[PDB]
Symmetry: C5
Subunit: 230 residues, 5 copies
């Protein structure tokens, strides 16, 4: 099944939205119902799978929530994103703060390493998401040296098996080279893993790893809508 997983085509998108104060209002039952119906229709259509909806309140100033969804074709993700912005009140009263796009590809050296969403694992309660850009000479470095560096990098995360990693190529889908998403039952586990991962040689070959988006998964869109400002 590993060959099928490595050969499968899956576009993934983290759509980060910022709430506009004073636009949502105080009566939100109909907004909740409309958003829930939109997501139910997305699920029924069977093209775009909504991996998660995350509350980003308190993480950074310019973000309020995030939608992680995956589809076989990128045009399906485009249609879902445009429809969410166009035909839902929740989409109309929110601005797009950041979009993280990626396309699933097999790893360069360790082909047994696959994204958590590709392997169909249960999403974690807490997520962190950020783009990544390697150094200019990273890819033309001696393949044995890069393979050893990546092996040490992966070994450094052996003490955090409860944190599931998604490392997806993001070339030509934005300003970045990779999209990284870490899911864990507890946020402190993600923080500790990020702290521990600084002790790796791979840190010498980093150009950009911002912005960060840290959020808590919500069971339903009502829980997210009822906490938004304005």
């Amino acid at each position: 099944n590993f060959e099928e997983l490595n050969s499968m085509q899956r576009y993934s998108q983290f759509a980060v939205f910022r709430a506009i104060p004073g636009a949502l209002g105080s009566d939100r039952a109909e907004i909740v119902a409309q958003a829930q119906s939109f997501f139910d229709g997305l699920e029924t259509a069977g093209k775009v799978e909504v991996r998660g909806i995350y509350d980003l309140a308190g993480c950074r100033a310019e973000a309020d929530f995030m939608i992680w969804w995956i589809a076989e074709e990128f045009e399906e993700i485009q249609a879902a994103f445009a429809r969410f912005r166009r035909e839902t009140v929740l989409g109309q009263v929110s601005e797009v703060a950041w979009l993280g796009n990626s396309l699933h590809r097999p790893a360069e050296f360790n082909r047994s390493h696959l994204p958590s969403f590709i392997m169909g694992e249960i999403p974690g309660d807490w997520i962190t998401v950020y783009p990544f850009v390697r150094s200019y000479d990273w890819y033309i470095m001696d393949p044995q040296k890069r393979r050893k560096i990546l092996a040490e990098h992966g070994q450094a995360a052996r003490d955090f098996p409860d944190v599931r990693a998604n490392t997806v190529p993001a070339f030509a889908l934005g300003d970045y080279e990779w999209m990284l998403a870490f899911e864990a039952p507890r946020l402190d586990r993600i923080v500790d893993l990020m702290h521990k991962m600084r002790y790796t040689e791979a840190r010498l070959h980093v150009r950009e790893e911002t912005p960060f988006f840290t959020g808590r998964r919500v069971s339903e869109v009502s829980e997210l809508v009822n906490v938004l400002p304005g």
Copy 2:
């Protein structure tokens, strides 16, 4: 033939526009008709050739669609751009997010390499566009060394004949040195080509290659207008 193609003068522009939420509205038949009439008049005039209209939804937060058009004189492009912003409702309800200008010139060493729009090829279904700035010492480097680096760079793209490249000088037309546009029937081909091109020595002489704009070509302006946010 090739000498004439290398000697012809052609200005090209990627005009990227962002939709203003709450401005387009829900009734869009007359807006579609007016935009289509504007583009038909542009085609009839025969000065500005609209190479393509692309839907950028889901690519990045600050972009919504893109117009790629080419004219012999830059005054004609200026007039078309101003007229689109001034006399069309679609232009009036959109903000200009980014402009990529370029002027066609023959290549430094491989004079047989020509832009896809200069060759008059059929535009691809998917496009990616970004500006490019080389390193400070790139142009004063030993011409033989730079020629060999560029030859290896080109050779690295031998496995993607279905991805057509447009590399056009952009000096003094903006903040950048080159404008790069890649057209392909499938987006995954563009992503794979961009990933593969990282394994080149030319990556050691890069200063700026952002922002990126990835989009899908639309057959007519109605298809684009009907998906924009209200």
Copy 3:
């Protein structure tokens, strides 16, 4: 008690808010009462401890005040922040300018060094807060060399015992690695400490240390509200 203080889990947040001119109005008695009731309810609930409210007027153009609060679970901080933005007029008429999140962890070498808020010290009259990012090679450097550098760094502050330091890990909670907060009875002491600390080898291993937020602690929220613009 030191082991428990190094083992306790505490999330800390500096929520920086900017006032919107013309939104607060001139009649502020009811706004003051509502904000005071919100903070009293926060204190009564016993989950989120508001360490301080600080007036940032005159520090920088994009900030007006700041709330420093600490909770055992980050979801409690999220709920408090969202509730402040949603159910108080003061939170509705202000924008979020910057959020500094951190999770308390024991120090790498000097485990006797603890944050002032962890030790339960009385907050100082003046505070300065900024994020911090170390150099790429800082964590993979020889542990003895880094320990010596950090020892010299801490020793350089021998002459400022009245300035209490809070150095908290901030990995995966934002764009930064550390969150630093210095509390002192006098602002000039903070300025002198920051000037003196430039004479350390650790300054050779700094990547980002901005933005800064310098403020005065207010006894009650009325004192802050009565000086806000508009």
Copy 4:
């Protein structure tokens, strides 16, 4: 006369303005008349000389037009700029996007090199304008080495006599060190000159050279006003 030209005191300003969509309207006869009267009064007063008015449409997203004007005293330029923003509808419905200030000084080595506006040449149909910041060690370089580098730089532009250069010091008048303005009858000449000038050793001593503003000179302000967005 060369000594008199070198000793002459002349402040020059490129004031770049961006049109606010929806503010100018459709009836522009009275606006055109008022702007023309303002510029005629400026010419009659004899203090501020308007070198040119340039249409920047299609160059970059944040610019719409530019005014190049020169006066003996900088307070005269300040007064003219304030009056244009205050007493003309065109000034009131536009935002200031960028200001390039400079004061004429003789060249360091080649004192025969003078700005085109100092020599009183006829302005070209096309202009490009950008600020410039040299490297930190550029000025403390060995004077003979810097003189040789500058001589080679000037010699590299021997094939573009139709492009007139304006290199003016800009220290303490902004964020930059120099203001550069190139005027040519054809835009392609400016593009070719900028491309050719990359093959110089001086490119090794560049820190900032952006933003760029490329525009076409208009005969009268009516031509500019009639093309601005509504």
Copy 5:
């Protein structure tokens, strides 16, 4: 005398404001009277000394005027700044663009060098103001080497005795390390001094010296208000 000047406590602030077009209006007599009354009350209170009010029109796009004021305690500056933004129409119709804070301290080596405002000199007709950040290794450099570099730097300004310099520490009061203000009867003298100062070894140890604010001192607030955009 000099010991008292080096030991006195003085906070200084440059508050830069940008005018909001369409907010001031055309009838400005009462606004002028209210602003003048506010400044007269500030003078009468005797705590905050307004060193100057400067017209920044034509300097940069994001600035319109500047207030330079000095007080013994930073709380007094905070109160004056908040009161200006809160109780004056001029403060209400303007937005803070940049704040430069500093605290007077004696120089490291040449203790006879004091800020012009500390020595009580008459303010010049023209001012330039900018923040400054030294290199990372500047303060841990060999003290004799740094002293020699600073001596050569100071000596390089031997030919500009008419330009008075204010170099004040700015640590922990913002994003910067130093705040520099140069006052001169003529702006061309400031430009020439800044040009000449580039020929110093100290230029090798600069990290940040922007933004710049150049302005002309006004005799009274009416002169400033009457030129602001409507």
